[PDB]
Amino acid sequence: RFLKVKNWETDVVLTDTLHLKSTLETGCTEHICMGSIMLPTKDQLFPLAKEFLDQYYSSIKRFGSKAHMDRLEEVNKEIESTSTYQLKDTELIYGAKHAWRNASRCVGRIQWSKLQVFDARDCTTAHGMFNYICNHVKYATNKGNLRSAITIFPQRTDGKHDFRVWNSQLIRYAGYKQPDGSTLGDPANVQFTEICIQQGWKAPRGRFDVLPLLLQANGNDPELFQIPPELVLEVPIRHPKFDWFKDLGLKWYGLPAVSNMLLEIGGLEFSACPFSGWYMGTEIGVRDYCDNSRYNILEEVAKKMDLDMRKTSSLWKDQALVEINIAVLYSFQSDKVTIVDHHSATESFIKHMENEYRCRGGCPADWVWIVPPMSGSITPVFHQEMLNYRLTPSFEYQPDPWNTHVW
Amino acid sequence: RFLKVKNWETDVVLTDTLHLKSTLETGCTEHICMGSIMLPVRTKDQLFPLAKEFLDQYYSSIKRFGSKAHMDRLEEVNKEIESTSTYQLKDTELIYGAKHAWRNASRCVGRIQWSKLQVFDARDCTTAHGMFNYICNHVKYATNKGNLRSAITIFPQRTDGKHDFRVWNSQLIRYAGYKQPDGSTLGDPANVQFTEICIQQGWKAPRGRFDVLPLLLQANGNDPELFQIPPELVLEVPIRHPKFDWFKDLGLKWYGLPAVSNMLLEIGGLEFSACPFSGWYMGTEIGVRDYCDNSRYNILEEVAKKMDLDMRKTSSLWKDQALVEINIAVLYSFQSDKVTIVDHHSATESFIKHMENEYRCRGGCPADWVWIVPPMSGSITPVFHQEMLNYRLTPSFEYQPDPWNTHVWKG
Ligand code: HEM
Ligand code: HEM
Ligand SMILES: N=C(Nc1cccc(COC[C@@H]2C[C@H](OCc3cccc(NC(=N)c4cccs4)c3)CN2)c1)c1cccs1
Ligand SMILES: N=C(Nc1cccc(COC[C@@H]2C[C@H](OCc3cccc(NC(=N)c4cccs4)c3)CN2)c1)c1cccs1
Ligand SMILES: C[C@H](O)[C@H](O)[C@H]1CNc2nc(N)[nH]c(=O)c2N1
Ligand SMILES: C[C@H](O)[C@H](O)[C@H]1CNc2nc(N)[nH]c(=O)c2N1
Ligand SMILES: [Zn+2]
């Protein structure tokens, strides 16, 4: 019931009790581990509400005060009456910060408590949503000195009036299937790019076309909006040693901003809650650039490097992978756009786990996601045992809206 | 119940039914996943079901399930259990058992090779000198002058738990580690405690950076005894780099034969506490882990110094750069001296093919993603993108406590 995790590099042992609070389920059983699987009413809502308010009031040293009991009373009456309830601002901010704090897949959580929360619960239309989103983009970008932020749209009611951003991230590049048979741009986005075109978007049909936003307010049909280009900070990718690197025509955007997740606070569901921080270098250079199903650029880069591509054992892929990642970091740094390398990010996360173990009794962490997709064992997280479990408030996956929406 | 895994690079979806045959527990529950935890005296009582389940698997594998040979074997094992409290495996069952323990090892990326395993039956062994002789033969057979062949040697099984056969070494071939008075370490820091045990048992340490450890062998629950593997049997590879001529001057070498000697092999409820097995290296095991772990030889700094990379900021990726160079060197050296090795691209690609084949013919392949994904360049190997299901089948290889922790000294 008290659980130990060990770091095998430093022998530091932490004891986890926080897991006992865990409410939701992992996918695993005693007979099978699902650790590497990507995705494993009035009566329901009041316990969820209570458990939330309990931790909130405990967090401000007012557990079992009249302020606590009164709020529990007030939310209880409101659920009884309206079948839902409204969060105070203070609760909303707390709930959102803790959803990040509880995100077991997130290596960047040392920053969890510095999150700007934009309350957009008063929003009613897609134009409104566009406005809120542009303000978020500009605030978070901050001319390259990025700041973490979340914007929170109205909460699900009867589920026929959902707010949704259809984009997977606020800023992403278009993907186009060609006569060729090959793919121009980002193949991850082929489908969404066709939904946009099917909606009216004037596709430039280039390699790096910023997607339009497709915003759904109140369960209505989503509408297209172009983000003002002046608000989309992009970085040309060059190498501090290879002159020819720039000839590849690579660029990426500065602001990673997830928009397809569902934020759950005290039983309430926020289906539109775009959030943003900044990139770890490997996200772009390893995954965006080198995944076979992504821009998949390793062959061209190795070619330009004149490596022996005959045998896998020359480690030409590995050589090219490193150079590509050196260049991503160098470019962002040169242009003063916030980025973190995998060494610094993972070091910070170890320090964050130590803080959490001490202050909170644990830190849910998903090793499969936390370990960077290159140089795993030369980062300290590789050698760190982690316990994974689900705490609320949380960010959750939800199905892509086009499968759901009724046109 | 049927369970699906998806490869996210290829969209290939596989369906697992094999997981239904799993008995042992994982460590996980519906409320916690323990997938990254490194580690999450039998009665007649528990023994006959374990024997029966094993013999049913064995007789099904040879397409003789329910035959008279099958039934007579069950009866004969049953009788032997109640009469002697244990039972002996036939040679064929032992072979089948050892191969399947490898087939079932969810953390092993090399399982495409599981059915090519030379099994040496050492159950007639009685003394530590006997064990040394068995182990020398295994090393010479497996080494095969560079052209490595997989093998396991299997000493007598546990009886009362007070007469265990054990190899004290963690690997048959491993380098010594020495803690210096100034607190630095000479040789391999991982083997310090074991090296100290050897010295105290009477080993004369050469005290260099790559001293091959002596074997410390325990027969029949007796105090262990020291033996030196004949040096002519220990194939080693000097490490050099194909382009960097200063690399040789780092003075690095490694041994060619990886041979795990501290695991327990469980077959039909029987426990083989000494079962050294060997195959060959994937390059990253040496170039990433043995050379570049901070707690191991830790050569990253010295390598990047010689490469004159910018070491002033981690964001130069000087570590990542030196890491690739060291791994090229390891593969280059082995291939040049014609000593079997596999790179992590080739090994992971073969594993995916093995895995698909296993789902097809067997109904599943238990796999531990934390361990299967290589410790460098994770996502440019196909396994990173492969969903996997981890569960425990028997026969199996299991961890056991270090014997210096449990042994009753005779003196
Ligand atoms: C401030 C800098 C931040 C860094 C450097 C960072 C780093 C990361 C990285 C690298 C991932 C893995 C992404 C992938 O492989 O696709 C991730 C996952 C995640 N992070 Fe962050 N993070 C940051 C801030 C945030 C913020 C502000 C939130 C929300 C408030 C957040 C919530 C998450 C969630 C929910 C996941 C998992 C997504 C999923 O399961 O698909 N992080 N983090
Ligand atoms: C034939 C060549 C083989 C290759 C290339 C290979 C590859 C590997 C590698 C790279 C590991 C991870 C080791 C580590 O990080 O410490 C491993 C684990 C393992 N393999 Fe193999 N393997 C091979 C043959 C075998 C054989 C012959 C057996 C036994 C019959 C075996 C059983 C295991 C077991 C039990 C583990 C997990 C060890 C643990 O949990 O600590 N493999 N395999
Ligand atoms: N530095 C960052 N990187 C970052 C952080 C978090 C997330 C991401 C973007 O990655 C998300 C992708 C998304 C991707 O998920 C794959 C996938 C494919 C198809 C469907 C679903 N899920 C579904 N909608 C469902 C179908 C059926 C039932 S549910 C997931 C993995 N991963 C980047 C930051 C972004 C925001 C703040 S920091
Ligand atoms: N290519 C190969 N490499 C290979 C394959 C398997 C294993 C290894 C090397 O494994 C050694 C490292 C070391 C690591 O084990 C961690 C560890 C540390 C300390 C103790 C224990 N276990 C215990 N004795 C216990 C304490 C308390 C209860 S039990 C485990 C796993 N791993 C190499 C092959 C070897 C043989 C055939 S292929
Ligand atoms: C199948 C496997 O779970 C999948 O490839 C995961 C592995 N680890 C990951 N880790 C991160 N940070 N991001 C990812 O998208 C993935 N993908
Ligand atoms: C804590 C963590 O589970 C531990 O460091 C594991 C991770 N994956 C591994 N994978 C392999 N193949 N070998 C290892 O020693 C480890 N170490
Ligand atoms: Zn699990």
Short mmCIF file of N, CA, C and O in Angstrom, two decimals, chain B residues 1-99:
data_model
loop_
_atom_site.label_atom_id
_atom_site.label_comp_id
_atom_site.label_asym_id
_atom_site.label_seq_id
_atom_site.Cartn_x
_atom_site.Cartn_y
_atom_site.Cartn_z
N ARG B 1 -11.63 -13.80 -24.22
CA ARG B 1 -11.40 -12.36 -24.51
C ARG B 1 -10.20 -12.17 -25.44
O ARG B 1 -9.17 -12.83 -25.31
N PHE B 2 -10.37 -11.24 -26.38
CA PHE B 2 -9.39 -10.94 -27.43
C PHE B 2 -8.88 -9.52 -27.19
O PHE B 2 -9.67 -8.62 -26.93
N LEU B 3 -7.55 -9.32 -27.27
CA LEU B 3 -6.96 -8.00 -27.07
C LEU B 3 -6.18 -7.51 -28.28
O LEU B 3 -5.38 -8.25 -28.85
N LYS B 4 -6.38 -6.26 -28.66
CA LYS B 4 -5.70 -5.72 -29.84
C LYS B 4 -4.50 -4.82 -29.51
O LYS B 4 -4.57 -4.04 -28.57
N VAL B 5 -3.41 -4.99 -30.27
CA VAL B 5 -2.30 -4.07 -30.35
C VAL B 5 -2.17 -3.50 -31.77
O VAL B 5 -2.37 -4.20 -32.76
N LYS B 6 -1.82 -2.22 -31.83
CA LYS B 6 -1.65 -1.48 -33.05
C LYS B 6 -0.22 -0.97 -33.14
O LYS B 6 0.39 -0.55 -32.14
N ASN B 7 0.35 -1.10 -34.33
CA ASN B 7 1.52 -0.36 -34.67
C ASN B 7 1.10 0.98 -35.26
O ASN B 7 0.33 1.05 -36.23
N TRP B 8 1.60 2.06 -34.67
CA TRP B 8 1.16 3.40 -35.06
C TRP B 8 1.91 3.98 -36.25
O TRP B 8 1.51 5.01 -36.78
N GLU B 9 2.96 3.31 -36.68
CA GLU B 9 3.67 3.69 -37.88
C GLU B 9 3.06 3.05 -39.12
O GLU B 9 2.97 3.70 -40.15
N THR B 10 2.60 1.80 -38.98
CA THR B 10 2.09 0.97 -40.10
C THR B 10 0.59 0.69 -40.09
O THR B 10 0.06 0.11 -41.04
N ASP B 11 -0.10 1.05 -39.02
CA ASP B 11 -1.50 0.68 -38.77
C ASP B 11 -1.84 -0.82 -38.70
O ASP B 11 -3.01 -1.19 -38.56
N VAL B 12 -0.82 -1.68 -38.79
CA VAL B 12 -1.01 -3.11 -38.57
C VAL B 12 -1.56 -3.33 -37.14
O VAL B 12 -0.95 -2.86 -36.15
N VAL B 13 -2.70 -4.01 -37.06
CA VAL B 13 -3.37 -4.35 -35.81
C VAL B 13 -3.27 -5.87 -35.58
O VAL B 13 -3.60 -6.64 -36.48
N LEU B 14 -2.83 -6.29 -34.40
CA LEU B 14 -2.75 -7.73 -34.08
C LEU B 14 -3.70 -8.07 -32.93
O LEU B 14 -4.08 -7.19 -32.16
N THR B 15 -4.08 -9.35 -32.81
CA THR B 15 -5.10 -9.76 -31.84
C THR B 15 -4.49 -10.81 -30.94
O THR B 15 -3.90 -11.78 -31.41
N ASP B 16 -4.58 -10.60 -29.62
CA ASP B 16 -3.91 -11.48 -28.70
C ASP B 16 -4.90 -12.31 -27.96
O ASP B 16 -5.77 -11.77 -27.28
N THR B 17 -4.78 -13.63 -28.10
CA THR B 17 -5.51 -14.56 -27.23
C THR B 17 -4.58 -15.31 -26.26
O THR B 17 -5.05 -15.84 -25.24
N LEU B 18 -3.28 -15.37 -26.57
CA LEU B 18 -2.31 -16.08 -25.71
C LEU B 18 -2.33 -15.62 -24.25
O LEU B 18 -2.00 -16.41 -23.36
N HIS B 19 -2.71 -14.35 -24.01
CA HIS B 19 -2.68 -13.73 -22.67
C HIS B 19 -3.59 -14.46 -21.70
O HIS B 19 -3.39 -14.37 -20.50
N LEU B 20 -4.57 -15.19 -22.23
CA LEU B 20 -5.48 -16.01 -21.43
C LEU B 20 -4.80 -17.20 -20.71
O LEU B 20 -5.36 -17.73 -19.74
N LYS B 21 -3.63 -17.61 -21.19
CA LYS B 21 -2.90 -18.74 -20.61
C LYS B 21 -1.96 -18.27 -19.51
O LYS B 21 -1.32 -19.09 -18.85
N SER B 22 -1.86 -16.96 -19.30
CA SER B 22 -0.94 -16.44 -18.30
C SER B 22 -1.42 -16.71 -16.87
O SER B 22 -2.58 -16.47 -16.55
N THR B 23 -0.54 -17.20 -16.01
CA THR B 23 -0.94 -17.46 -14.61
C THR B 23 -0.33 -16.45 -13.64
O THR B 23 -1.07 -15.83 -12.84
N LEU B 24 0.99 -16.26 -13.73
CA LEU B 24 1.75 -15.41 -12.81
C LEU B 24 1.24 -13.96 -12.87
O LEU B 24 0.58 -13.57 -13.85
N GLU B 25 1.52 -13.18 -11.83
CA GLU B 25 1.04 -11.79 -11.77
C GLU B 25 2.04 -10.77 -12.30
O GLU B 25 3.23 -11.08 -12.42
N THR B 26 1.56 -9.57 -12.66
CA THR B 26 2.41 -8.56 -13.32
C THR B 26 3.00 -7.52 -12.40
O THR B 26 4.03 -6.92 -12.71
N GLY B 27 2.34 -7.27 -11.27
CA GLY B 27 2.67 -6.11 -10.47
C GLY B 27 1.62 -5.04 -10.64
O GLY B 27 1.39 -4.26 -9.72
N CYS B 28 0.96 -4.99 -11.80
CA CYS B 28 -0.03 -3.93 -12.06
C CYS B 28 -1.36 -4.26 -11.45
O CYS B 28 -1.62 -5.40 -11.16
N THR B 29 -2.20 -3.26 -11.26
CA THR B 29 -3.62 -3.47 -10.96
C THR B 29 -4.45 -2.54 -11.85
O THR B 29 -3.89 -1.80 -12.68
N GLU B 30 -5.77 -2.52 -11.68
CA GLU B 30 -6.57 -1.55 -12.42
C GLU B 30 -6.33 -0.12 -11.97
O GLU B 30 -6.79 0.81 -12.62
N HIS B 31 -5.59 0.07 -10.87
CA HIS B 31 -5.36 1.41 -10.30
C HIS B 31 -3.92 1.94 -10.38
O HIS B 31 -3.67 3.14 -10.17
N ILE B 32 -2.98 1.05 -10.69
CA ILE B 32 -1.58 1.40 -10.83
C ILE B 32 -0.90 0.53 -11.88
O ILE B 32 -1.21 -0.67 -12.01
N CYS B 33 -0.03 1.16 -12.66
CA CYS B 33 0.79 0.45 -13.62
C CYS B 33 2.20 0.49 -13.11
O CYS B 33 2.72 1.57 -12.76
N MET B 34 2.79 -0.69 -13.04
CA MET B 34 4.13 -0.88 -12.51
C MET B 34 5.09 -1.31 -13.59
O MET B 34 6.19 -1.87 -13.32
N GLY B 35 4.71 -0.98 -14.82
CA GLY B 35 5.49 -1.35 -16.00
C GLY B 35 6.92 -0.84 -16.05
O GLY B 35 7.73 -1.41 -16.78
N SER B 36 7.26 0.21 -15.29
CA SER B 36 8.69 0.64 -15.28
C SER B 36 9.47 0.24 -14.01
O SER B 36 10.63 0.64 -13.84
N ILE B 37 8.84 -0.51 -13.11
CA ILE B 37 9.54 -1.06 -11.93
C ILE B 37 10.46 -2.19 -12.41
O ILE B 37 10.02 -3.10 -13.13
N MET B 38 11.73 -2.11 -12.04
CA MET B 38 12.73 -3.08 -12.50
C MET B 38 12.44 -4.50 -11.99
O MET B 38 12.57 -5.44 -12.75
N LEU B 39 12.02 -4.64 -10.73
CA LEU B 39 11.49 -5.93 -10.23
C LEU B 39 10.14 -5.77 -9.48
O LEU B 39 10.14 -5.52 -8.27
N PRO B 40 9.00 -5.91 -10.18
CA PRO B 40 7.72 -5.75 -9.44
C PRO B 40 7.27 -7.04 -8.72
O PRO B 40 8.06 -7.66 -8.00
N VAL B 41 11.79 -24.93 -2.16
CA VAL B 41 10.80 -24.83 -1.07
C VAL B 41 9.32 -24.91 -1.58
O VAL B 41 8.45 -24.19 -1.07
N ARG B 42 9.05 -25.78 -2.56
CA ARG B 42 7.67 -26.07 -3.06
C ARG B 42 7.06 -27.39 -2.55
O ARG B 42 7.74 -28.42 -2.55
N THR B 43 5.78 -27.37 -2.14
CA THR B 43 5.07 -28.58 -1.68
C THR B 43 4.53 -29.39 -2.85
O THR B 43 4.30 -28.85 -3.94
N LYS B 44 4.33 -30.70 -2.60
CA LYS B 44 3.63 -31.62 -3.51
C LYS B 44 2.29 -31.01 -3.90
O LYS B 44 1.79 -31.18 -5.02
N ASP B 45 1.73 -30.29 -2.93
CA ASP B 45 0.53 -29.48 -3.04
C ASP B 45 0.48 -28.70 -4.36
O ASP B 45 -0.31 -29.02 -5.26
N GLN B 46 1.33 -27.68 -4.46
CA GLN B 46 1.37 -26.82 -5.64
C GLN B 46 2.03 -27.49 -6.86
O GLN B 46 1.73 -27.10 -7.99
N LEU B 47 2.90 -28.48 -6.62
CA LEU B 47 3.70 -29.11 -7.69
C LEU B 47 2.96 -29.90 -8.80
O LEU B 47 3.23 -29.66 -9.97
N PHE B 48 2.04 -30.81 -8.47
CA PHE B 48 1.39 -31.56 -9.56
C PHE B 48 0.61 -30.73 -10.62
O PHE B 48 0.72 -31.03 -11.80
N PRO B 49 -0.16 -29.71 -10.20
CA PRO B 49 -0.79 -28.83 -11.21
C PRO B 49 0.23 -28.17 -12.14
O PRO B 49 -0.04 -28.03 -13.35
N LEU B 50 1.36 -27.75 -11.58
CA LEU B 50 2.40 -27.09 -12.38
C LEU B 50 3.03 -28.09 -13.35
O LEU B 50 3.32 -27.75 -14.49
N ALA B 51 3.25 -29.32 -12.90
CA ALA B 51 3.79 -30.34 -13.76
C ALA B 51 2.77 -30.67 -14.87
O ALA B 51 3.10 -30.70 -16.06
N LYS B 52 1.52 -30.88 -14.48
CA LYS B 52 0.45 -31.23 -15.43
C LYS B 52 0.27 -30.21 -16.56
O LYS B 52 0.20 -30.57 -17.73
N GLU B 53 0.19 -28.94 -16.19
CA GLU B 53 0.03 -27.85 -17.15
C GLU B 53 1.21 -27.83 -18.13
O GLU B 53 1.01 -27.77 -19.34
N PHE B 54 2.44 -27.89 -17.61
CA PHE B 54 3.62 -28.07 -18.45
C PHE B 54 3.57 -29.28 -19.44
O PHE B 54 3.80 -29.09 -20.63
N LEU B 55 3.22 -30.48 -18.96
CA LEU B 55 3.18 -31.68 -19.80
C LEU B 55 2.06 -31.62 -20.83
O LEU B 55 2.24 -32.07 -21.96
N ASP B 56 0.92 -31.04 -20.47
CA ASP B 56 -0.11 -30.73 -21.45
C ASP B 56 0.45 -29.81 -22.56
O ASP B 56 0.24 -30.06 -23.74
N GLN B 57 1.20 -28.77 -22.20
CA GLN B 57 1.75 -27.89 -23.24
C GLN B 57 2.74 -28.67 -24.11
O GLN B 57 2.89 -28.39 -25.29
N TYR B 58 3.51 -29.55 -23.47
CA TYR B 58 4.59 -30.22 -24.16
C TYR B 58 4.00 -31.24 -25.12
O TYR B 58 4.37 -31.29 -26.30
N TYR B 59 3.05 -32.02 -24.63
CA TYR B 59 2.41 -33.03 -25.47
C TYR B 59 1.58 -32.43 -26.63
O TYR B 59 1.59 -33.00 -27.74
N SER B 60 0.87 -31.31 -26.39
CA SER B 60 0.28 -30.52 -27.48
C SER B 60 1.33 -30.04 -28.49
O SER B 60 1.10 -30.13 -29.68
N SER B 61 2.47 -29.53 -28.02
CA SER B 61 3.47 -29.07 -28.99
C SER B 61 3.94 -30.20 -29.94
O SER B 61 4.17 -29.94 -31.11
N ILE B 62 4.06 -31.43 -29.43
CA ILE B 62 4.48 -32.56 -30.26
C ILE B 62 3.29 -33.29 -30.91
O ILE B 62 3.45 -34.39 -31.46
N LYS B 63 2.11 -32.68 -30.85
CA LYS B 63 0.90 -33.27 -31.46
C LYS B 63 0.57 -34.68 -30.97
O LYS B 63 0.16 -35.58 -31.76
N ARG B 64 0.70 -34.86 -29.66
CA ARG B 64 0.41 -36.12 -29.00
C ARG B 64 -0.46 -35.93 -27.75
O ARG B 64 -0.42 -36.74 -26.84
N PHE B 65 -1.23 -34.85 -27.71
CA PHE B 65 -2.06 -34.51 -26.56
C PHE B 65 -3.13 -35.56 -26.41
O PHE B 65 -3.89 -35.82 -27.35
N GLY B 66 -3.21 -36.17 -25.23
CA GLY B 66 -4.23 -37.17 -24.98
C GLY B 66 -3.79 -38.55 -25.41
O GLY B 66 -4.48 -39.51 -25.16
N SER B 67 -2.62 -38.67 -26.02
CA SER B 67 -2.12 -39.98 -26.39
C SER B 67 -1.86 -40.82 -25.13
O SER B 67 -1.86 -40.31 -23.99
N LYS B 68 -1.59 -42.10 -25.33
CA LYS B 68 -1.25 -42.95 -24.23
C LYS B 68 0.11 -42.53 -23.67
O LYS B 68 0.31 -42.60 -22.46
N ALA B 69 1.03 -42.08 -24.53
CA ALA B 69 2.33 -41.61 -24.08
C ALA B 69 2.15 -40.40 -23.15
O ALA B 69 2.79 -40.32 -22.12
N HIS B 70 1.27 -39.48 -23.54
CA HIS B 70 0.89 -38.36 -22.70
C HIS B 70 0.34 -38.81 -21.35
O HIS B 70 0.83 -38.39 -20.30
N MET B 71 -0.69 -39.64 -21.36
CA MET B 71 -1.27 -40.09 -20.11
C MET B 71 -0.31 -40.85 -19.19
O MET B 71 -0.36 -40.67 -17.98
N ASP B 72 0.54 -41.72 -19.75
CA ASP B 72 1.45 -42.55 -18.97
C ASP B 72 2.47 -41.61 -18.31
O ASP B 72 2.88 -41.85 -17.18
N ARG B 73 2.89 -40.57 -19.03
CA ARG B 73 3.83 -39.58 -18.50
C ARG B 73 3.24 -38.82 -17.31
O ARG B 73 3.90 -38.70 -16.28
N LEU B 74 2.01 -38.31 -17.44
CA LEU B 74 1.27 -37.73 -16.30
C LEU B 74 1.21 -38.67 -15.09
O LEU B 74 1.57 -38.27 -13.97
N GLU B 75 0.76 -39.90 -15.32
CA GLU B 75 0.69 -40.90 -14.26
C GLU B 75 2.05 -41.09 -13.61
O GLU B 75 2.19 -40.98 -12.40
N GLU B 76 3.07 -41.36 -14.43
CA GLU B 76 4.46 -41.53 -13.95
C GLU B 76 5.02 -40.31 -13.17
O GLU B 76 5.72 -40.50 -12.17
N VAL B 77 4.75 -39.10 -13.64
CA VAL B 77 5.15 -37.88 -12.91
C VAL B 77 4.38 -37.76 -11.57
O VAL B 77 4.96 -37.45 -10.53
N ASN B 78 3.09 -38.04 -11.62
CA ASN B 78 2.22 -38.00 -10.47
C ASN B 78 2.77 -38.92 -9.38
O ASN B 78 2.94 -38.49 -8.23
N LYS B 79 3.07 -40.16 -9.76
CA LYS B 79 3.60 -41.15 -8.82
C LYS B 79 4.92 -40.70 -8.24
O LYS B 79 5.16 -40.86 -7.05
N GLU B 80 5.77 -40.13 -9.08
CA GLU B 80 7.09 -39.73 -8.64
C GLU B 80 7.02 -38.54 -7.66
O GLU B 80 7.73 -38.53 -6.64
N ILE B 81 6.12 -37.59 -7.92
CA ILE B 81 5.85 -36.52 -6.97
C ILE B 81 5.43 -37.03 -5.57
O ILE B 81 6.07 -36.71 -4.58
N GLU B 82 4.38 -37.83 -5.48
CA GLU B 82 3.93 -38.30 -4.16
C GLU B 82 4.94 -39.22 -3.46
O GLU B 82 4.98 -39.28 -2.24
N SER B 83 5.74 -39.93 -4.25
CA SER B 83 6.77 -40.80 -3.68
C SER B 83 8.03 -40.03 -3.24
O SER B 83 8.54 -40.26 -2.14
N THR B 84 8.53 -39.14 -4.08
CA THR B 84 9.79 -38.42 -3.83
C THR B 84 9.62 -36.92 -3.58
O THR B 84 10.58 -36.24 -3.20
N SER B 85 8.41 -36.40 -3.79
CA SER B 85 8.07 -34.97 -3.57
C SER B 85 8.51 -34.04 -4.68
O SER B 85 8.27 -32.83 -4.63
N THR B 86 9.17 -34.60 -5.68
CA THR B 86 9.68 -33.83 -6.80
C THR B 86 9.55 -34.75 -8.01
O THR B 86 8.90 -35.79 -7.93
N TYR B 87 10.16 -34.37 -9.14
CA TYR B 87 10.23 -35.27 -10.29
C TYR B 87 11.34 -34.79 -11.22
O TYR B 87 11.74 -33.64 -11.13
N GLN B 88 11.84 -35.68 -12.07
CA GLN B 88 12.88 -35.36 -13.06
C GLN B 88 12.28 -35.20 -14.44
O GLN B 88 11.44 -36.03 -14.86
N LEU B 89 12.74 -34.19 -15.16
CA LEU B 89 12.34 -33.99 -16.56
C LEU B 89 13.09 -34.95 -17.47
O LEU B 89 14.28 -35.19 -17.28
N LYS B 90 12.39 -35.52 -18.46
CA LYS B 90 13.06 -36.19 -19.57
C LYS B 90 13.85 -35.16 -20.36
O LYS B 90 13.52 -33.98 -20.34
N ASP B 91 14.86 -35.62 -21.08
CA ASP B 91 15.71 -34.75 -21.85
C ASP B 91 14.92 -33.92 -22.81
O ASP B 91 15.16 -32.73 -22.93
N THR B 92 13.99 -34.54 -23.52
CA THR B 92 13.22 -33.80 -24.45
C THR B 92 12.42 -32.65 -23.83
O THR B 92 12.27 -31.59 -24.45
N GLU B 93 11.86 -32.89 -22.64
CA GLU B 93 11.05 -31.90 -21.92
C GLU B 93 11.94 -30.76 -21.43
O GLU B 93 11.53 -29.60 -21.41
N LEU B 94 13.14 -31.11 -21.02
CA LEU B 94 14.11 -30.09 -20.54
C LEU B 94 14.41 -29.11 -21.69
O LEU B 94 14.35 -27.88 -21.51
N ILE B 95 14.68 -29.67 -22.87
CA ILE B 95 15.01 -28.90 -24.06
C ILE B 95 13.86 -27.98 -24.41
O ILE B 95 14.05 -26.79 -24.62
N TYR B 96 12.67 -28.57 -24.54
CA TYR B 96 11.46 -27.84 -24.81
C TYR B 96 11.30 -26.75 -23.77
O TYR B 96 10.99 -25.62 -24.12
N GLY B 97 11.49 -27.11 -22.49
CA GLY B 97 11.31 -26.13 -21.39
C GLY B 97 12.22 -24.90 -21.49
O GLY B 97 11.78 -23.76 -21.30
N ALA B 98 13.49 -25.15 -21.80
CA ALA B 98 14.49 -24.09 -21.85
C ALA B 98 14.25 -23.16 -23.06
O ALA B 98 14.25 -21.92 -22.96
N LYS B 99 13.95 -23.75 -24.22
CA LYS B 99 13.56 -22.97 -25.36
C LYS B 99 12.33 -22.14 -25.05
O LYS B 99 12.27 -21.01 -25.49
#
